[PDB]
């Protein structure tokens, strides 16, 4: 099936969404119009449609078992979406929870999703930690560069695993400070 | 008491078992009583009821397809166990054999356990090597720190795959010298 | 019964090379492995389905059809282990502009059922220089960190194959001037 479906992951702060946007932006110039979607958002939308919530807070409290179903359906919806346009699913490779690294796209989601590319945007633990500091929305944690680095290591493994299970290729892009443009150009080459 | 299955993994010497023992102790006096059990142990117990072996090293040389049945059965037996008590499985992410790294939880075993967390305990290659050099009943082979770190790199990857194959969270706890109590407390919290 | 091992490594590691040196030895010891490149087998299937007639036409091959050939490939190689132990030469992940592509997707793994996955590697510096000196490869512009990243992703994928098929994952270093030690280690896991 034409219309590529890719998922752009990265650690909070690498600005995967940012370079994704500028890539779409710049790509649109050549008639290519990707549909960005946030996986967590889709589950929320499937929740409302299945009559199960009314806001993003009834999702966390939503039954653990049925939460797998919502993931399956959310994977179906997006799959159906590439029928009408190339899609970028903005989600996590692994979500860093206090209980540990949680897979953003478990296998039962990948079967319904069938991605073509898994982007893993990265940069230095240093850069990421500073970005979060010059960020007013944050200013809370104590996440060290080794922790960010460790996270980026697990995401990588998760991505590759996703790749093997889905056949999708895993692309690693470095979004380094004062070099945004190069990251963006890198991404554009893989989405085009 | 009811359900919550977890697997604690670690390379020999990191003391994943130890910190698990402490955690389980401080937990029983909180009402939470986990039944710990070794995956190797159960497989043996299972092979015996099937009258397949006498001693453990008899399973060394055991039919490849038999080992798969045993595993699937030992993962199922351990599975039923979560019905009457939260369980912690003491096992290896991968076993460093001279034939390479053997996955401790093959997909068919994962589909039986359906664990919730995959604990991965680590420390520097140096710390482990010195813990191995000092061990009395050990003193064998000649593994290098890089080797130990290689094993930990692979266990991390293995762990992550398990998480992707079951939706289970992957938590890395650092059990470093003279910091045993921080690791125990950290393990307790995820078992909470 | 016949062992089925798949050998991997980034281009330049001499992964195929140590495997050949290893087969010569195991041969004069009775054990005879049949080496085969997964890419060739794929092409072989395709050039029989009349879908392709040139190694290059494979690239142009349909994306869904590409999968059907990978399955058929695993099935042939699988059937090969009925006759002799088999070594499959392939990449854990092929480093493309689109990124790291898994050399053995799960639908291939199920047909293959390998017993051992081998990861042949060395330092970013050795690979890079080995490539540099080859009259053919002189302008790929991939740095040592680049190769190292590729090797990192190779381990992950190789490990995933093990988790999915139960196969063991043996990492082996093939460093300059120590070729024989790499070949030796390989012989130990193959016999």
From Swiss-Prot, chains A, B:
Q: Which enzyme class?
A: transferase
Catalytic activity entry: AMP + ATP = 2 ADP
**Listed Gene3D superfamilies:** P-loop containing nucleotide triphosphate hydrolases (3.40.50.300)
On whether Oxidoreductase is a keyword of this UniProt record, the answer is no
Q: Look up the domain of life of the source.
A: Archaea
- Primary location recorded for the protein, binned into one broad class: cytoplasm
EC number annotated for this UniProt entry: 2.7.4.3
InterPro entries from the entry? Adenylate_kinase_AdkA, P-loop_NTPase
How does activity change as temperature rises? Active from 60 to 80 degrees Celsius.
- Name the keywords, alphabetized: ATP-binding, Cytoplasm, Kinase, Nucleotide-binding, Transferase
Q: Where in the cell is it found?
A: Cytoplasm
Keyword hit for Cell inner membrane: no
One protein family per Pfam? AAA_17
Tell me the protein family, please.
Answer: Belongs to the archaeal adenylate kinase family.
Q: What is this protein called?
A: Adenylate kinase
Per the UniProt entry, what species is this protein from, by scientific name? Answer: Methanothermococcus thermolithotrophicus
The taxonomic lineage of its organism, from the top, reads: Archaea, Methanobacteriati, Methanobacteriota, Methanomada group, Methanococci
